[PDB]
Amino acid sequence: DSDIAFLIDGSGSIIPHDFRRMKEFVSTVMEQLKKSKTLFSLMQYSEEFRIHFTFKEFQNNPNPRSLVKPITQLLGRTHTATGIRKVVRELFNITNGARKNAFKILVVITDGEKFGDPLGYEDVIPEADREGVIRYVIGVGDAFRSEKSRQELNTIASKPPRDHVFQVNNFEALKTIQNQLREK
Ligand SMILES: [Ca+2]
């Protein structure tokens, strides 16, 4: 009943230590929220986009650590808004494994510093809302130490953002989220 996608920031601003955290967070979530009726998908982004595993591919090999271990950082710019648009349109595409009727959950992991992207959030959020894609934002790096980046997470996250935005090293975020998913 749940299709869960991850949009992970692979741009250059993302320090290697932090990209690893992103992969460790994603792997743990998959292992924790592993429900017989829950599929996972992941796309990495910078200026270019990469679907590491579709819902179908996960359904064919539900081994989190196996799917996440080969993932290498793309580097480059940060086209977050475009990435969100591609996720809803490409990941939650039934030709990719997405199931009609299932709840749509997107976990966006970034440092909150969109750059180079020709699209603004205001261009991709309405469509996400329209597709009923619930958004969780996990902030890595200095995402919370800047006024700009802090608001970027709030802008991406569903309402209320305070209930949808977590720090990557708040190891208690997965249980809060999981607790929340019982209230879809
Ligand atoms: Ca970046």
UniProtKB/Swiss-Prot annotation:
Domain VWFA residues, every copy:
3-181
Tissue spec. comment: Predominantly expressed in monocytes and granulocytes. Expressed in neutrophils (at protein level).
Location(s) in or outside the cell:
Cell membrane; Membrane raft
Please indicate which superkingdom the organism of origin belongs to. Eukaryota
Per the UniProt entry, the glycosylated residues are: 93
Its domain comment says: The integrin I-domain (insert) is a VWFA domain. Integrins with I-domains do not undergo protease cleavage.
- Give the similarity note: Belongs to the integrin alpha chain family.
Q: What does this protein do?
A: Integrin ITGAM/ITGB2 is implicated in various adhesive interactions of monocytes, macrophages and granulocytes as well as in mediating the uptake of complement-coated particles and pathogens. It is identical with CR-3, the receptor for the iC3b fragment of the third complement component. It probably recognizes the R-G-D peptide in C3b. Integrin ITGAM/ITGB2 is also a receptor for fibrinogen, factor X and ICAM1. It recognizes P1 and P2 peptides of fibrinogen gamma chain. Regulates neutrophil migration.
The UniProt subunit note reads as follows:
Heterodimer of an alpha and a beta subunit. ITGAM associates with ITGB2. Found in a complex with CD177 and ITGB2/CD18. Interacts with JAM3. Interacts with THBD. Interacts with complement factor H/CFH; this interaction mediates adhesion of neutrophils to pathogens leading to pathogen clearance. Interacts with TMEM268; this interaction inhibits ITGAM degradation via the endosome-lysosome pathway.
Disorder association? Systemic lupus erythematosus 6: A chronic, relapsing, inflammatory, and often febrile multisystemic disorder of connective tissue, characterized principally by involvement of the skin, joints, kidneys and serosal membranes. It is of unknown etiology, but is thought to represent a failure of the regulatory mechanisms of the autoimmune system. The disease is marked by a wide range of system dysfunctions, an elevated erythrocyte sedimentation rate, and the formation of LE cells in the blood or bone marrow.
Record-given protein name: Integrin alpha-M
The protein's organism comes out as Homo sapiens
Organism ancestry: Eukaryota, Metazoa, Chordata, Craniata, Vertebrata
Give from-to of the shown chain within the full protein: 148 to 331 of 1152
